[PDB]
Symmetry: C2
Subunit: 289 residues, 2 copies
């Protein structure tokens, strides 16, 4: 526990627009055992509603966050829902403020679930990838930080037991997609760091792009996104667990452009929740009314 927090009479969650004086955290959040996150406030809101209907609830799924807040926050039974924007720094803001919230509420050993979108490597678009490791662009299982101007690295740890439970569950469901277990690269850029040729700047050839991506695949990487190393390093360090459940929107061994229709992208992006929603129903995420 960050000992400095106890020196505060009131702790302001700036990016969620409330403070420790806004509610009684233990009463309001004490029963939380799952935190579902993704880059889109709209998608995670819709997922929250879907879980509320699964739980047989008939009550408004209200945003707990302030109206001018950067992030949204919903609660359905034992699950918190929040967005995290795009990129490690944005995700870290969510992680700091949400893990503090869990601390004030007395929640222990919570499972963070990132329901994301990603670029696939050697899998068909629309595939769900269950990350079994989260690595940087050098394929190292670490998140890098620069703290007080000094280099710091934090190891990434995926909850492999839950990953295997999810894979097994997928074998007993009727998903119209494949579910693959594999490694996941997190990058600080959508274009150049992910080896895309179609950014506004590109200093490499398709041959060099191919060598980079094929090497990743040969090391077991099956998708690529922008938050995984932050989520799977931070949670472990604050005493919680984390997994990534991300759908693929393109096969990067075939192209860079996201060419699938807006409707198909939206459909694809709901597939992680389709799997995880059933998982939550079977593991006390919701009360099955």
């Amino acid at each position: 526990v960050n000992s400095h927090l106890s020196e505060l009479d009131e702790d302001v969650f700036h990016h969620f627009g409330f403070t420790t004086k806004s509610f009684d955290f233990k009463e309001k959040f004490g029963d939380v055992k799952f935190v579902c996150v993704c880059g889109s406030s709209g998608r995670i809101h819709n997922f929250a509603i879907s879980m509320a209907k699964l739980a047989g609830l008939a009550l408004p799924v209200e945003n707990i966050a302030g109206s001018h807040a950067r992030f949204v926050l919903y609660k359905v039974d034992h699950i918190l829902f929040a967005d995290h924007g795009m990129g490690i720094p944005s995700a870290l803001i969510m992680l700091h403020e949400v893990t503090k919230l869990l601390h004030y509420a007395g929640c222990k050993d919570v499972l963070f679930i990132r329901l994301g979108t990603s670029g696939g490597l050697g899998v068909k678009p629309g595939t769900i990838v269950l990350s079994d490791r989260c690595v940087n662009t050098k394929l190292e299982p670490y998140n890098e930080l620069c703290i007080l101007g000094k280099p710091v690295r934090r190891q990434t740890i995926v909850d492999l037991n839950t990953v295997n439970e999810l894979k097994k569950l997928s074998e007993n469901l009727s998903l119209e997609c494949s579910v693959v277990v594999g490694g996941t690269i997190a990058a600080n850029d959508f274009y150049e760091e992910q080896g895309r040729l179609d950014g506004s700047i590109c200093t490499f050839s398709k041959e060099e792009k191919l060598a980079f991506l094929q090497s990743a695949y040969e090391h077991g990487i099956r998708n690529m996104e922008m938050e995984g190393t932050a989520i799977t390093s931070h949670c472990y360090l604050t005493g919680h667990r984390a997994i990534l459940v991300c759908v693929t929107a393109v096969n990067r061994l075939e192209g860079d452009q996201i060419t699938i229709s807006t409707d198909e992208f939206t459909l694809f992006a709901q597939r992680p929740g389709q799997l995880v929603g059933e998982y939550l129903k079977r593991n006390n995420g919701i009360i099955v009314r």
Copy 2:
């Protein structure tokens, strides 16, 4: 200065803005753009676009050019583009790549990017506008670091100092509710630990070490800290454009970490960069005064 691979594409999809090169005639639609105003919030930049539309004497609503499912918004008022960029360098780089590609297809040359942000102050009172005269990383280096194909790359940051000086001069002739300050700006990849905050969920340093880090920053001329500057000011230069940062402060980090000001006053402070830049754009052919 142009990525040759773009010409391989019959159609270029701007994924995070939800349109393509086939969606409009980019030359016709965007060819007159000479300014791009950005910040972290879609709401704040829309409201700024609206106030510029009023200044330009337009009565019609400012409508989103981006697709409805898009990650970012995009507005246009006369010669000015408006877009949000989320929080952090990777988010900002996505906006930067797709917008500079847009400017390329439209044939726009030498465009000024203006980031209208919020930040933590160093030795200045909350609500102060800082005009960045340099953007540096947490090691106080004027570079943005990237890892491309797994290899380290560094790109120098370049601020349009002429425009900065003009903005300082302009502020001296306006009745602003706040002070305007020229100084250096740190860009960090974290709101909490990388900015030396003691109130994160994790903290591996003491108050003395924080102040030692911040005092060193101040002594190197740093006056505020935010999360996108090194991306904006390295990327624009490299694609043939100019960039400046105009950020208000929401806290004096030499005194504390918590943002204690009310949400309303924060929103008020956050409009102050646009208060100054709005008048600048009016006086420099950003809008057509009708």
